[PDB]
Amino acid sequence: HLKPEKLQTRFLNGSQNDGPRYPRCYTLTHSDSTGELFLTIGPSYDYEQISGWYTRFMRDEVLAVWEMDEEDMALHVHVHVSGGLILGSAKWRDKIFRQHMPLVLEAFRYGDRELVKKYPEMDQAPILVHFHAPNPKFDLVETWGILRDYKI
Amino acid sequence: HLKPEKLQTRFLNGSQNDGPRYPRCYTLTHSDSTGELFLTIGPSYDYEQISGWYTRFMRDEVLAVWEMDEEDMALHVHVHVSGGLILGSAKWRDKIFRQHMPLVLEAFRYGDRELVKKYPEMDQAPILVHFHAPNPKFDLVETWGILRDYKI
């Protein structure tokens, strides 16, 4: 489980804690030196946060995008299981991301909690997780419940 | 069934019929007037090919990218089943894309047949089709055999 006091939240221009609902993207990284999680909420992804040779080599970020559909919205989450010149085998990386996915989704719903309060319908929205890999074995899109399931 | 006289194959700067193997992307559009198919092969997508108002409304282009899994290869195909203001419901679009998918994969195999000659391991590559949609019901990634399935 998530430790709220270890979660820093930043907003990109065009996004605030009260909206808008769309466009709305999440960028999530961490530091194993401090154990803290860093969440940016914005119209798109946080390119400062995912910059530098380190994150390009570890590719440990979690990105997410709220997508409009006919039944309100859905959250599309993305993690880089394999591909390119990165640390770790596809099978390790897949195992660690799956391990930490409940923590990831808890950070999204704690971090953006004011918006859930304002629009309780997002808290029923489905969560779709795409484990990206070149290999069909690991390239999987999965439903991981809804947002209220990750209430802390 | 693919009718090769109805297929035009085109190369962007940086690609030829004999390579390079990577990066290599396919952009497939059609003329409803004549039933002709337009395939472009290059280092990336032919963005001008897919830029017309007709494509913006029908979103019936097919995009594909060859992806590296260390030394192994896999063809990742992309179709827009749902999302945005477009012609047709998800259910209807999904059905037509799936009925025409063998034709599409046959155009890829015929259009790029000389590269497959040169690198026969390319016929054994898995084809992975992503039916894009915001909704879990239609947002599916599926293996559709191997390239060699779709020779004519």
UniProtKB/TrEMBL annotation, chains A, B:
Domain of life: Bacteria
Stated name of the protein: Uncharacterized protein
Naturally occurring in which organism (per UniProt): Anaerolineae bacterium
Biological classification of the source: Bacteria, Bacillati, Chloroflexota, Anaerolineae
